[PDB]
mmCIF file of N, CA and C in Angstrom:
data_model
loop_
_atom_site.group_PDB
_atom_site.id
_atom_site.type_symbol
_atom_site.label_atom_id
_atom_site.label_comp_id
_atom_site.label_asym_id
_atom_site.label_seq_id
_atom_site.Cartn_x
_atom_site.Cartn_y
_atom_site.Cartn_z
ATOM 1 N N UNK A 1 3.893 30.842 -6.251
ATOM 2 C CA UNK A 1 4.385 30.037 -7.255
ATOM 3 C C UNK A 1 5.612 30.263 -7.720
ATOM 4 N N UNK A 2 5.469 31.440 -8.191
ATOM 5 C CA UNK A 2 6.980 32.217 -9.396
ATOM 6 C C UNK A 2 8.187 32.415 -8.495
ATOM 7 N N UNK A 3 7.799 32.167 -7.175
ATOM 8 C CA UNK A 3 8.956 32.151 -6.394
ATOM 9 C C UNK A 3 8.929 31.157 -5.338
ATOM 10 N N UNK A 4 9.199 29.663 -5.562
ATOM 11 C CA UNK A 4 8.913 28.871 -4.832
ATOM 12 C C UNK A 4 10.241 28.617 -4.045
ATOM 13 N N UNK A 5 10.263 28.061 -3.001
ATOM 14 C CA UNK A 5 11.020 28.150 -2.161
ATOM 15 C C UNK A 5 11.407 26.249 -2.343
ATOM 16 N N UNK A 6 13.259 26.519 -2.725
ATOM 17 C CA UNK A 6 13.729 25.062 -2.752
ATOM 18 C C UNK A 6 14.935 24.691 -1.604
ATOM 19 N N UNK A 7 14.585 23.782 -0.862
ATOM 20 C CA UNK A 7 15.333 23.163 0.097
ATOM 21 C C UNK A 7 16.395 22.221 -0.485
ATOM 22 N N UNK A 8 17.994 22.369 -0.270
ATOM 23 C CA UNK A 8 18.356 20.943 -0.109
ATOM 24 C C UNK A 8 18.769 20.012 1.377
ATOM 25 N N UNK A 9 18.570 18.915 1.087
ATOM 26 C CA UNK A 9 18.423 17.936 2.225
ATOM 27 C C UNK A 9 19.003 16.703 1.759
ATOM 28 N N UNK A 10 20.284 16.919 2.791
ATOM 29 C CA UNK A 10 21.729 16.069 2.698
ATOM 30 C C UNK A 10 22.006 16.029 4.120
ATOM 31 N N UNK A 11 22.611 14.464 3.907
ATOM 32 C CA UNK A 11 23.485 14.486 5.159
ATOM 33 C C UNK A 11 22.757 13.967 6.193
ATOM 34 N N UNK A 12 21.536 13.160 6.241
ATOM 35 C CA UNK A 12 20.651 12.723 7.077
ATOM 36 C C UNK A 12 19.823 11.240 6.946
ATOM 37 N N UNK A 13 19.249 11.104 7.867
ATOM 38 C CA UNK A 13 18.472 9.777 7.845
ATOM 39 C C UNK A 13 16.978 9.938 7.874
ATOM 40 N N UNK A 14 16.666 9.747 6.875
ATOM 41 C CA UNK A 14 14.952 9.924 5.972
ATOM 42 C C UNK A 14 14.145 8.555 6.505
ATOM 43 N N UNK A 15 13.436 9.278 7.560
ATOM 44 C CA UNK A 15 11.662 8.711 7.651
ATOM 45 C C UNK A 15 10.522 9.022 6.731
ATOM 46 N N UNK A 16 10.064 8.614 5.764
ATOM 47 C CA UNK A 16 8.936 8.882 5.284
ATOM 48 C C UNK A 16 7.746 8.564 6.033
ATOM 49 N N UNK A 17 7.765 8.067 7.051
ATOM 50 C CA UNK A 17 6.253 7.702 7.073
ATOM 51 C C UNK A 17 6.005 8.776 8.608
ATOM 52 N N UNK A 18 6.645 10.222 8.666
ATOM 53 C CA UNK A 18 6.312 10.713 9.506
ATOM 54 C C UNK A 18 5.066 12.129 8.836
ATOM 55 N N UNK A 19 5.387 12.166 7.503
ATOM 56 C CA UNK A 19 4.723 13.375 6.578
ATOM 57 C C UNK A 19 3.544 13.287 6.676
ATOM 58 N N UNK A 20 2.810 11.674 7.032
ATOM 59 C CA UNK A 20 1.482 11.977 7.186
ATOM 60 C C UNK A 20 0.717 12.429 8.606
ATOM 61 N N UNK A 21 1.857 12.413 9.527
ATOM 62 C CA UNK A 21 1.686 13.413 10.725
ATOM 63 C C UNK A 21 1.629 14.446 10.561
ATOM 64 N N UNK A 22 2.788 15.047 9.927
ATOM 65 C CA UNK A 22 3.314 16.526 9.696
ATOM 66 C C UNK A 22 2.039 16.975 8.696
ATOM 67 N N UNK A 23 1.441 16.431 8.097
ATOM 68 C CA UNK A 23 0.436 17.018 7.050
ATOM 69 C C UNK A 23 -1.025 16.850 6.833
ATOM 70 N N UNK A 24 -2.053 16.887 6.551
ATOM 71 C CA UNK A 24 -3.514 16.483 6.412
ATOM 72 C C UNK A 24 -3.680 16.151 4.781
ATOM 73 N N UNK A 25 -3.213 15.468 4.379
ATOM 74 C CA UNK A 25 -3.175 14.766 3.402
ATOM 75 C C UNK A 25 -3.549 13.458 2.816
ATOM 76 N N UNK A 26 -4.457 13.628 1.478
ATOM 77 C CA UNK A 26 -4.798 11.827 1.216
ATOM 78 C C UNK A 26 -3.561 11.244 0.579
ATOM 79 N N UNK A 27 -3.366 11.322 -0.437
ATOM 80 C CA UNK A 27 -2.569 10.658 -0.955
ATOM 81 C C UNK A 27 -0.737 10.865 -1.081
ATOM 82 N N UNK A 28 -0.101 10.214 -1.081
ATOM 83 C CA UNK A 28 1.302 10.736 -1.054
ATOM 84 C C UNK A 28 1.744 9.963 -2.463
ATOM 85 N N UNK A 29 1.589 10.884 -3.556
ATOM 86 C CA UNK A 29 1.479 10.303 -4.897
ATOM 87 C C UNK A 29 3.296 10.361 -5.160
ATOM 88 N N UNK A 30 3.530 9.822 -6.086
ATOM 89 C CA UNK A 30 4.724 9.398 -6.105
ATOM 90 C C UNK A 30 4.926 8.788 -7.842
ATOM 91 N N UNK A 31 6.054 9.296 -8.528
ATOM 92 C CA UNK A 31 6.031 8.611 -9.932
ATOM 93 C C UNK A 31 7.115 7.924 -10.255
ATOM 94 N N UNK A 32 8.542 7.844 -9.773
ATOM 95 C CA UNK A 32 9.554 7.161 -10.475
ATOM 96 C C UNK A 32 9.631 6.267 -9.508
ATOM 97 N N UNK A 33 9.183 6.034 -8.204
ATOM 98 C CA UNK A 33 9.290 5.317 -6.844
ATOM 99 C C UNK A 33 7.616 4.807 -6.369
ATOM 100 N N UNK A 34 7.746 4.024 -5.269
ATOM 101 C CA UNK A 34 6.590 3.691 -4.931
ATOM 102 C C UNK A 34 6.396 4.547 -3.302
ATOM 103 N N UNK A 35 5.598 5.254 -2.527
ATOM 104 C CA UNK A 35 4.967 5.601 -1.309
ATOM 105 C C UNK A 35 5.934 4.943 -0.262
ATOM 106 N N UNK A 36 5.395 3.449 -0.538
ATOM 107 C CA UNK A 36 5.864 2.478 0.724
ATOM 108 C C UNK A 36 7.264 2.147 0.449
ATOM 109 N N UNK A 37 7.864 2.209 -0.355
ATOM 110 C CA UNK A 37 9.188 1.484 -0.886
ATOM 111 C C UNK A 37 10.337 2.977 -0.548
ATOM 112 N N UNK A 38 9.768 3.667 -0.035
ATOM 113 C CA UNK A 38 10.864 4.873 0.366
ATOM 114 C C UNK A 38 11.746 4.899 1.474
ATOM 115 N N UNK A 39 11.845 3.710 2.535
ATOM 116 C CA UNK A 39 13.058 3.943 3.264
ATOM 117 C C UNK A 39 13.713 2.731 3.180
ATOM 118 N N UNK A 40 13.584 1.915 2.421
ATOM 119 C CA UNK A 40 14.549 0.544 1.878
ATOM 120 C C UNK A 40 15.772 1.413 0.809
ATOM 121 N N UNK A 41 15.169 1.848 -0.354
ATOM 122 C CA UNK A 41 16.298 2.212 -0.821
ATOM 123 C C UNK A 41 16.487 3.583 -0.495
ATOM 124 N N UNK A 42 17.555 4.581 -0.967
ATOM 125 C CA UNK A 42 18.318 5.794 -0.362
ATOM 126 C C UNK A 42 18.830 6.583 -1.566
ATOM 127 N N UNK A 43 18.874 7.497 -1.599
ATOM 128 C CA UNK A 43 19.194 8.433 -3.028
ATOM 129 C C UNK A 43 20.779 9.592 -1.864
ATOM 130 N N UNK A 44 20.950 9.969 -3.275
ATOM 131 C CA UNK A 44 22.378 11.438 -2.798
ATOM 132 C C UNK A 44 21.846 12.110 -2.504
ATOM 133 N N UNK A 45 20.781 13.023 -2.748
ATOM 134 C CA UNK A 45 20.422 14.276 -2.328
ATOM 135 C C UNK A 45 18.820 14.131 -2.309
ATOM 136 N N UNK A 46 18.166 14.872 -1.730
ATOM 137 C CA UNK A 46 16.422 15.192 -1.873
ATOM 138 C C UNK A 46 16.539 16.961 -2.058
ATOM 139 N N UNK A 47 15.781 17.268 -3.124
ATOM 140 C CA UNK A 47 15.280 18.793 -3.105
ATOM 141 C C UNK A 47 13.949 18.999 -2.487
ATOM 142 N N UNK A 48 13.515 19.365 -1.475
ATOM 143 C CA UNK A 48 11.681 20.174 -1.368
ATOM 144 C C UNK A 48 11.740 21.650 -1.663
ATOM 145 N N UNK A 49 10.569 21.472 -2.957
ATOM 146 C CA UNK A 49 10.384 22.658 -3.355
ATOM 147 C C UNK A 49 8.954 23.014 -2.610
ATOM 148 N N UNK A 50 8.566 23.973 -2.276
ATOM 149 C CA UNK A 50 7.247 24.389 -1.533
ATOM 150 C C UNK A 50 6.492 25.974 -1.747
ATOM 151 N N UNK B 1 -14.521 -1.411 10.058
ATOM 152 C CA UNK B 1 -13.741 -0.855 10.645
ATOM 153 C C UNK B 1 -13.631 0.391 10.576
ATOM 154 N N UNK B 2 -13.202 1.111 10.918
ATOM 155 C CA UNK B 2 -12.632 2.703 10.829
ATOM 156 C C UNK B 2 -11.239 2.974 11.000
ATOM 157 N N UNK B 3 -10.672 3.634 10.173
ATOM 158 C CA UNK B 3 -9.769 4.106 9.851
ATOM 159 C C UNK B 3 -9.622 5.655 9.966
ATOM 160 N N UNK B 4 -8.221 6.229 9.667
ATOM 161 C CA UNK B 4 -7.880 7.379 9.281
ATOM 162 C C UNK B 4 -8.242 7.644 7.854
ATOM 163 N N UNK B 5 -7.594 8.833 7.348
ATOM 164 C CA UNK B 5 -7.833 9.114 5.549
ATOM 165 C C UNK B 5 -6.366 8.826 5.195
ATOM 166 N N UNK B 6 -5.436 8.951 6.038
ATOM 167 C CA UNK B 6 -4.140 8.115 5.348
ATOM 168 C C UNK B 6 -3.867 7.081 5.561
ATOM 169 N N UNK B 7 -4.831 6.146 6.052
ATOM 170 C CA UNK B 7 -4.843 4.710 6.032
ATOM 171 C C UNK B 7 -5.819 3.720 5.181
ATOM 172 N N UNK B 8 -6.423 4.774 4.551
ATOM 173 C CA UNK B 8 -7.268 4.010 3.279
ATOM 174 C C UNK B 8 -6.786 3.507 2.248
ATOM 175 N N UNK B 9 -5.642 4.112 1.743
ATOM 176 C CA UNK B 9 -4.953 3.517 0.670
ATOM 177 C C UNK B 9 -4.190 2.284 1.557
ATOM 178 N N UNK B 10 -4.597 1.475 2.228
ATOM 179 C CA UNK B 10 -3.131 0.834 2.866
ATOM 180 C C UNK B 10 -4.341 -0.815 2.698
ATOM 181 N N UNK B 11 -5.571 -0.483 2.430
ATOM 182 C CA UNK B 11 -6.520 -1.635 2.624
ATOM 183 C C UNK B 11 -6.567 -1.821 1.053
ATOM 184 N N UNK B 12 -5.725 -2.316 0.712
ATOM 185 C CA UNK B 12 -5.322 -2.836 -0.849
ATOM 186 C C UNK B 12 -4.408 -4.106 -0.783
ATOM 187 N N UNK B 13 -5.038 -5.006 -2.057
ATOM 188 C CA UNK B 13 -3.630 -6.139 -1.851
ATOM 189 C C UNK B 13 -2.555 -5.556 -2.643
ATOM 190 N N UNK B 14 -1.250 -6.241 -1.967
ATOM 191 C CA UNK B 14 0.069 -5.949 -2.143
ATOM 192 C C UNK B 14 0.298 -4.547 -1.754
ATOM 193 N N UNK B 15 -0.085 -3.785 -0.477
ATOM 194 C CA UNK B 15 0.249 -2.887 0.178
ATOM 195 C C UNK B 15 1.091 -3.265 1.422
ATOM 196 N N UNK B 16 1.589 -2.506 1.685
ATOM 197 C CA UNK B 16 2.437 -2.842 3.017
ATOM 198 C C UNK B 16 2.429 -1.248 3.798
ATOM 199 N N UNK B 17 2.201 -1.667 4.807
ATOM 200 C CA UNK B 17 2.011 -0.235 5.825
ATOM 201 C C UNK B 17 1.710 -0.625 7.207
ATOM 202 N N UNK B 18 1.972 0.661 8.332
ATOM 203 C CA UNK B 18 1.593 0.471 9.693
ATOM 204 C C UNK B 18 0.170 -0.754 9.693
ATOM 205 N N UNK B 19 -0.825 0.032 8.977
ATOM 206 C CA UNK B 19 -2.334 -0.862 9.084
ATOM 207 C C UNK B 19 -2.245 -2.159 8.400
ATOM 208 N N UNK B 20 -1.900 -2.072 7.193
ATOM 209 C CA UNK B 20 -1.570 -3.732 6.614
ATOM 210 C C UNK B 20 -0.801 -4.274 7.314
ATOM 211 N N UNK B 21 -0.131 -4.055 8.333
ATOM 212 C CA UNK B 21 1.398 -5.119 8.848
ATOM 213 C C UNK B 21 1.041 -5.307 10.130
ATOM 214 N N UNK B 22 0.028 -4.929 10.693
ATOM 215 C CA UNK B 22 0.146 -4.922 12.387
ATOM 216 C C UNK B 22 -1.396 -5.341 12.584
ATOM 217 N N UNK B 23 -2.757 -4.963 11.693
ATOM 218 C CA UNK B 23 -4.008 -4.399 12.222
ATOM 219 C C UNK B 23 -4.877 -4.951 10.982
ATOM 220 N N UNK B 24 -4.606 -4.991 9.724
ATOM 221 C CA UNK B 24 -5.609 -5.695 8.743
ATOM 222 C C UNK B 24 -5.369 -5.817 7.622
ATOM 223 N N UNK B 25 -4.696 -7.328 7.075
ATOM 224 C CA UNK B 25 -3.719 -7.525 6.120
ATOM 225 C C UNK B 25 -5.146 -8.159 4.964
ATOM 226 N N UNK B 26 -4.649 -7.472 3.730
ATOM 227 C CA UNK B 26 -5.448 -8.291 2.613
ATOM 228 C C UNK B 26 -4.713 -9.189 2.079
ATOM 229 N N UNK B 27 -5.607 -10.115 1.309
ATOM 230 C CA UNK B 27 -4.366 -11.494 0.637
ATOM 231 C C UNK B 27 -4.203 -10.700 -0.736
ATOM 232 N N UNK B 28 -2.995 -11.361 -1.501
ATOM 233 C CA UNK B 28 -2.209 -10.685 -2.943
ATOM 234 C C UNK B 28 -3.635 -11.265 -3.638
ATOM 235 N N UNK B 29 -4.087 -12.151 -3.504
ATOM 236 C CA UNK B 29 -5.156 -12.518 -4.589
ATOM 237 C C UNK B 29 -6.663 -12.223 -4.339
ATOM 238 N N UNK B 30 -6.643 -11.178 -3.832
ATOM 239 C CA UNK B 30 -7.922 -10.313 -3.496
ATOM 240 C C UNK B 30 -9.098 -10.522 -4.505
ATOM 241 N N UNK B 31 -9.930 -10.904 -4.046
ATOM 242 C CA UNK B 31 -11.551 -10.414 -5.384
ATOM 243 C C UNK B 31 -12.842 -10.417 -4.914
ATOM 244 N N UNK B 32 -12.732 -9.078 -4.079
ATOM 245 C CA UNK B 32 -13.831 -8.545 -3.830
ATOM 246 C C UNK B 32 -13.628 -6.859 -3.609
ATOM 247 N N UNK B 33 -14.827 -6.361 -2.987
ATOM 248 C CA UNK B 33 -14.450 -4.764 -3.049
ATOM 249 C C UNK B 33 -14.408 -4.208 -1.969
ATOM 250 N N UNK B 34 -14.086 -2.828 -1.912
ATOM 251 C CA UNK B 34 -13.525 -1.885 -0.217
ATOM 252 C C UNK B 34 -14.414 -0.603 -0.737
ATOM 253 N N UNK B 35 -15.251 -0.659 0.351
ATOM 254 C CA UNK B 35 -15.903 0.705 0.387
ATOM 255 C C UNK B 35 -15.318 1.660 1.526
ATOM 256 N N UNK B 36 -15.359 2.539 1.548
ATOM 257 C CA UNK B 36 -14.732 3.526 2.241
ATOM 258 C C UNK B 36 -15.516 4.810 2.132
ATOM 259 N N UNK B 37 -16.117 5.329 3.189
ATOM 260 C CA UNK B 37 -16.583 6.661 3.378
ATOM 261 C C UNK B 37 -16.182 7.405 4.719
ATOM 262 N N UNK B 38 -16.537 8.797 4.482
ATOM 263 C CA UNK B 38 -16.293 9.821 5.512
ATOM 264 C C UNK B 38 -17.294 9.599 6.516
ATOM 265 N N UNK B 39 -16.989 9.827 7.981
ATOM 266 C CA UNK B 39 -17.747 9.618 8.969
ATOM 267 C C UNK B 39 -17.093 10.779 10.350
ATOM 268 N N UNK B 40 -16.958 12.000 9.446
ATOM 269 C CA UNK B 40 -16.791 13.222 10.612
ATOM 270 C C UNK B 40 -17.986 13.141 11.561
ATOM 271 N N UNK B 41 -19.075 13.389 11.127
ATOM 272 C CA UNK B 41 -20.465 13.571 11.984
ATOM 273 C C UNK B 41 -20.581 12.464 12.679
ATOM 274 N N UNK B 42 -19.974 11.501 12.914
ATOM 275 C CA UNK B 42 -20.821 10.479 13.776
ATOM 276 C C UNK B 42 -19.317 9.896 14.236
ATOM 277 N N UNK B 43 -17.952 9.797 13.858
ATOM 278 C CA UNK B 43 -16.788 8.838 14.715
ATOM 279 C C UNK B 43 -16.118 10.084 15.259
ATOM 280 N N UNK B 44 -16.126 11.550 15.038
ATOM 281 C CA UNK B 44 -15.645 12.633 15.439
ATOM 282 C C UNK B 44 -16.468 13.342 16.873
ATOM 283 N N UNK B 45 -15.717 14.063 17.838
ATOM 284 C CA UNK B 45 -16.111 14.351 19.123
ATOM 285 C C UNK B 45 -15.020 15.360 19.360
ATOM 286 N N UNK B 46 -15.729 16.786 19.897
ATOM 287 C CA UNK B 46 -14.939 17.790 20.611
ATOM 288 C C UNK B 46 -13.919 17.421 21.757
ATOM 289 N N UNK B 47 -12.567 17.511 21.468
ATOM 290 C CA UNK B 47 -11.539 16.859 22.890
ATOM 291 C C UNK B 47 -11.203 15.655 22.324
ATOM 292 N N UNK B 48 -11.689 14.800 21.578
ATOM 293 C CA UNK B 48 -11.181 13.299 21.030
ATOM 294 C C UNK B 48 -12.188 12.571 20.925
ATOM 295 N N UNK B 49 -12.278 11.535 20.541
ATOM 296 C CA UNK B 49 -13.176 10.487 20.272
ATOM 297 C C UNK B 49 -11.966 9.109 20.517
ATOM 298 N N UNK C 1 -12.788 17.490 15.055
ATOM 299 C CA UNK C 1 -14.189 17.916 14.203
ATOM 300 C C UNK C 1 -12.854 19.175 13.709
ATOM 301 N N UNK C 2 -11.957 19.452 14.245
ATOM 302 C CA UNK C 2 -11.054 20.727 13.226
ATOM 303 C C UNK C 2 -9.873 20.137 12.894
ATOM 304 N N UNK C 3 -9.813 18.972 12.596
ATOM 305 C CA UNK C 3 -8.544 18.356 11.885
ATOM 306 C C UNK C 3 -8.739 18.668 10.303
ATOM 307 N N UNK C 4 -7.714 18.273 9.916
ATOM 308 C CA UNK C 4 -8.177 18.412 7.943
ATOM 309 C C UNK C 4 -8.734 17.105 7.816
ATOM 310 N N UNK C 5 -8.919 17.066 6.468
ATOM 311 C CA UNK C 5 -10.041 16.184 5.965
ATOM 312 C C UNK C 5 -8.949 14.797 5.398
ATOM 313 N N UNK C 6 -7.809 15.054 5.709
ATOM 314 C CA UNK C 6 -6.902 13.908 5.558
ATOM 315 C C UNK C 6 -6.736 12.975 7.127
ATOM 316 N N UNK C 7 -7.167 13.350 8.030
ATOM 317 C CA UNK C 7 -7.366 12.788 9.364
ATOM 318 C C UNK C 7 -8.678 12.619 9.927
ATOM 319 N N UNK C 8 -9.343 13.107 8.842
ATOM 320 C CA UNK C 8 -10.904 12.740 9.351
ATOM 321 C C UNK C 8 -10.641 11.175 9.420
ATOM 322 N N UNK C 9 -12.045 10.619 10.027
ATOM 323 C CA UNK C 9 -12.388 9.074 10.108
ATOM 324 C C UNK C 9 -12.838 8.423 9.221
ATOM 325 N N UNK C 10 -12.576 7.623 8.673
ATOM 326 C CA UNK C 10 -13.334 6.686 7.495
ATOM 327 C C UNK C 10 -14.148 5.712 7.915
ATOM 328 N N UNK C 11 -14.862 5.416 7.613
ATOM 329 C CA UNK C 11 -15.747 4.060 7.745
ATOM 330 C C UNK C 11 -15.388 2.896 6.510
ATOM 331 N N UNK C 12 -15.000 1.606 6.677
ATOM 332 C CA UNK C 12 -14.468 0.865 5.793
ATOM 333 C C UNK C 12 -15.223 -0.120 6.204
ATOM 334 N N UNK C 13 -15.820 -0.632 4.960
ATOM 335 C CA UNK C 13 -16.550 -2.387 5.105
ATOM 336 C C UNK C 13 -15.906 -2.735 3.264
ATOM 337 N N UNK C 14 -15.267 -4.066 3.683
ATOM 338 C CA UNK C 14 -14.854 -5.111 2.527
ATOM 339 C C UNK C 14 -15.780 -6.002 2.334
ATOM 340 N N UNK C 15 -16.289 -6.347 1.243
ATOM 341 C CA UNK C 15 -16.855 -7.342 1.163
ATOM 342 C C UNK C 15 -16.244 -8.057 0.070
ATOM 343 N N UNK C 16 -15.659 -9.670 0.541
ATOM 344 C CA UNK C 16 -14.924 -10.394 -0.162
ATOM 345 C C UNK C 16 -15.752 -11.562 -0.507
ATOM 346 N N UNK C 17 -15.406 -11.838 -1.920
ATOM 347 C CA UNK C 17 -16.373 -12.768 -2.313
ATOM 348 C C UNK C 17 -15.422 -14.268 -2.679
ATOM 349 N N UNK C 18 -16.348 -14.990 -2.873
ATOM 350 C CA UNK C 18 -15.548 -16.735 -2.843
ATOM 351 C C UNK C 18 -15.867 -17.139 -4.329
ATOM 352 N N UNK C 19 -14.907 -17.682 -5.017
ATOM 353 C CA UNK C 19 -15.131 -18.505 -6.210
ATOM 354 C C UNK C 19 -15.070 -19.912 -5.451
ATOM 355 N N UNK C 20 -15.078 -20.193 -4.990
ATOM 356 C CA UNK C 20 -14.911 -21.970 -4.743
ATOM 357 C C UNK C 20 -15.924 -22.381 -5.900
ATOM 358 N N UNK C 21 -15.707 -23.950 -5.703
ATOM 359 C CA UNK C 21 -16.519 -24.897 -6.633
ATOM 360 C C UNK C 21 -17.699 -25.582 -5.605
ATOM 361 N N UNK C 22 -18.050 -25.087 -4.699
ATOM 362 C CA UNK C 22 -18.905 -25.640 -3.752
ATOM 363 C C UNK C 22 -20.233 -24.934 -4.099
ATOM 364 N N UNK C 23 -21.723 -25.459 -4.046
ATOM 365 C CA UNK C 23 -22.977 -25.038 -4.449
ATOM 366 C C UNK C 23 -22.529 -23.731 -3.879
ATOM 367 N N UNK C 24 -23.326 -22.886 -4.400
ATOM 368 C CA UNK C 24 -23.705 -21.146 -4.663
ATOM 369 C C UNK C 24 -24.706 -20.976 -3.501
ATOM 370 N N UNK C 25 -24.529 -20.110 -2.743
ATOM 371 C CA UNK C 25 -25.327 -19.994 -1.609
ATOM 372 C C UNK C 25 -26.219 -18.527 -1.752
ATOM 373 N N UNK C 26 -24.832 -17.611 -2.549
ATOM 374 C CA UNK C 26 -25.706 -16.376 -2.539
ATOM 375 C C UNK C 26 -25.539 -15.985 -3.816
ATOM 376 N N UNK C 27 -26.797 -15.678 -4.518
ATOM 377 C CA UNK C 27 -26.988 -15.345 -5.781
ATOM 378 C C UNK C 27 -28.060 -14.336 -5.976
ATOM 379 N N UNK C 28 -27.691 -13.574 -7.170
ATOM 380 C CA UNK C 28 -28.513 -12.632 -7.393
ATOM 381 C C UNK C 28 -30.009 -12.627 -7.654
ATOM 382 N N UNK C 29 -30.677 -11.343 -8.245
ATOM 383 C CA UNK C 29 -32.099 -11.579 -8.504
ATOM 384 C C UNK C 29 -32.744 -11.973 -9.674
ATOM 385 N N UNK C 30 -31.709 -12.508 -10.581
ATOM 386 C CA UNK C 30 -31.449 -12.980 -11.829
ATOM 387 C C UNK C 30 -32.916 -14.530 -11.753
ATOM 388 N N UNK C 31 -34.113 -14.259 -12.398
ATOM 389 C CA UNK C 31 -34.723 -15.272 -12.408
ATOM 390 C C UNK C 31 -34.196 -16.675 -13.506
ATOM 391 N N UNK C 32 -34.497 -17.320 -12.859
ATOM 392 C CA UNK C 32 -34.359 -19.029 -13.827
ATOM 393 C C UNK C 32 -35.162 -19.222 -14.493
ATOM 394 N N UNK C 33 -34.623 -20.038 -15.608
ATOM 395 C CA UNK C 33 -35.721 -20.466 -17.133
ATOM 396 C C UNK C 33 -36.033 -22.261 -16.442
ATOM 397 N N UNK C 34 -36.314 -22.877 -17.800
ATOM 398 C CA UNK C 34 -36.705 -24.038 -17.417
ATOM 399 C C UNK C 34 -35.220 -24.514 -18.428
ATOM 400 N N UNK C 35 -35.035 -26.101 -18.466
ATOM 401 C CA UNK C 35 -34.120 -26.616 -18.954
ATOM 402 C C UNK C 35 -34.491 -26.959 -20.450
ATOM 403 N N UNK C 36 -33.788 -27.281 -21.511
ATOM 404 C CA UNK C 36 -33.489 -27.663 -22.467
ATOM 405 C C UNK C 36 -32.415 -28.434 -22.991
ATOM 406 N N UNK C 37 -32.627 -30.152 -23.464
ATOM 407 C CA UNK C 37 -31.689 -30.514 -23.658
ATOM 408 C C UNK C 37 -31.663 -30.994 -25.194
ATOM 409 N N UNK C 38 -30.544 -30.983 -26.167
ATOM 410 C CA UNK C 38 -30.434 -31.836 -27.221
ATOM 411 C C UNK C 38 -30.607 -30.521 -28.281
ATOM 412 N N UNK C 39 -30.365 -29.245 -27.889
ATOM 413 C CA UNK C 39 -30.578 -28.265 -28.576
ATOM 414 C C UNK C 39 -29.804 -27.250 -28.527
ATOM 415 N N UNK C 40 -28.786 -26.777 -29.465
ATOM 416 C CA UNK C 40 -27.940 -25.666 -29.586
ATOM 417 C C UNK C 40 -28.808 -24.228 -28.670
ATOM 418 N N UNK C 41 -28.600 -23.999 -27.633
ATOM 419 C CA UNK C 41 -28.569 -22.660 -26.931
ATOM 420 C C UNK C 41 -27.814 -21.953 -25.802
ATOM 421 N N UNK C 42 -27.985 -21.061 -25.837
ATOM 422 C CA UNK C 42 -27.206 -20.253 -24.729
ATOM 423 C C UNK C 42 -27.272 -20.431 -23.307
ATOM 424 N N UNK C 43 -26.350 -20.870 -22.617
ATOM 425 C CA UNK C 43 -26.611 -21.238 -20.828
ATOM 426 C C UNK C 43 -26.033 -20.140 -19.954
ATOM 427 N N UNK C 44 -26.798 -20.440 -18.863
ATOM 428 C CA UNK C 44 -25.912 -19.467 -18.060
ATOM 429 C C UNK C 44 -26.170 -20.117 -16.859
ATOM 430 N N UNK C 45 -24.930 -21.211 -16.248
ATOM 431 C CA UNK C 45 -25.211 -22.023 -15.050
ATOM 432 C C UNK C 45 -24.588 -21.156 -13.606
ATOM 433 N N UNK C 46 -25.166 -20.716 -12.598
ATOM 434 C CA UNK C 46 -24.511 -20.002 -11.886
ATOM 435 C C UNK C 46 -23.522 -19.114 -11.941
ATOM 436 N N UNK C 47 -23.938 -18.159 -13.153
ATOM 437 C CA UNK C 47 -22.537 -17.193 -13.561
ATOM 438 C C UNK C 47 -22.201 -17.658 -14.843
ATOM 439 N N UNK C 48 -22.062 -19.182 -14.579
ATOM 440 C CA UNK C 48 -21.164 -19.521 -15.933
ATOM 441 C C UNK C 48 -21.497 -19.666 -17.281
ATOM 442 N N UNK C 49 -21.387 -18.378 -18.157
ATOM 443 C CA UNK C 49 -22.253 -18.578 -19.604
ATOM 444 C C UNK C 49 -21.089 -19.200 -20.607
#
């Protein structure tokens, strides 16, 4: 946690319905958006912190 | 019915998704209760159910 | 059985109630009293208080 990995994701088409297959988690909690509306709207870049 | 753990949140009014769009759609004016409990000891078998 | 808890099966039961104006058929175990007229009283008619 003190050395969390940051990955920049850009220049690709993002389908957010495969993360459920990727990981066994209950809730795909989001703050500024809704989990089910993530395929219509689109951003500049997205950062993944692990 | 029986669903996955990821699709429990789709059984709710105003929710969209694979299950809520092709299998079971709830009305937006819904007035009722939803009960969900784990059945790993009943609906799961070794090698796949 | 070896998958994570997010992919485990879940049994779901949805109980949908009907707030119609037809006579009620499913009513709870609350007992009914007698009818008093021409007097200021509280009344509970089929859940209408």
